[PDB]
Amino acid sequence: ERAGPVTWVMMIACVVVFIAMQILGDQEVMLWLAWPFDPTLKFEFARYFTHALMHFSLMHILFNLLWWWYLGGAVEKRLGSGKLIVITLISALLSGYVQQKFSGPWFGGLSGVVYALMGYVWLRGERDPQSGIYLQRGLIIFALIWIVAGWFDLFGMSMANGAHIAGLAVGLAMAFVDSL
Ligand SMILES: CCCCCCCCCO[C@@H]1O[C@H](CO)[C@@H](O)[C@H](O)[C@H]1O
Ligand SMILES: CCCCCCCCCO[C@@H]1O[C@H](CO)[C@@H](O)[C@H](O)[C@H]1O
Ligand SMILES: CCCCCCCCCO[C@@H]1O[C@H](CO)[C@@H](O)[C@H](O)[C@H]1O
The phi, psi pair for 54, rounded to 5°, reads -95, 135
The amino acid at residue 137 is: R
Identify the CA nearest to 114 among candidates 155, 177, 2, 28. 155
Residues 6+ apart with CB under 8 A from 40: none
The letter for the amino acid at 140 is I
Query: CA–CA distance from 174 to each of 116, 154, 170 (Å)?
Result: 9, 29, 6
Q: 64 with 110: CB under 8 angstroms?
A: yes
- Asked if residue 123 lies in contact with residue 171, where contact means CB atoms within 8 angstroms, the answer is yes
State which of 60, 62, 68, 70 you would mutate to test the pocket of ligand 3, scoring each by most atoms of that ligand within 8 A of its C-beta: 70
Resolution in A: 1.7
- DSSP assignment, residue 22? H
In short, whether 6's Cβ falls inside 6 Å of ligand 1 is: no
CA pair distance 143, 160, nearest whole angstrom = 17
- Rounded to whole angstroms, how far apart are CA atoms 157 and 150? 6
CATH class of 1-180: mainly alpha
Nearest one of 79, 84, 71 to 142, comparing CA atoms: 71
The identity of residue 127, as a single letter, is: R
Task: Count the alpha carbons within 13 Å of 132 in the hemisphere toward its beta carbon.
Answer: 7
Which structural technique was applied? X-ray
Looking at residue 90, its amino acid is I
Q: Say yes or no: CB of residue 141 within 6 Å of ligand 1.
A: no
Report whether 113 contacts 71 (CB < 8 A): no
Its sign, for the CA torsion 137, 53, 26, 168, is: negative
- Coil, strand or helix: which one is 35? coil
Give the integer Cα–Cα distance in Å for 73 and 2: 8
69 within ligand 3 shell (Cβ under 6 A): no
Q: Are the beta carbons of 68 and 117 closer than 8 angstroms? A: yes
CA–centroid distance, 169 to ligand 3, in Å, is 25
Q: 139 in ligand 2 pocket by Cβ < 6 Å?
A: no
Q: Please, what is the end-to-end C-alpha distance for the chain in angstroms? A: 29
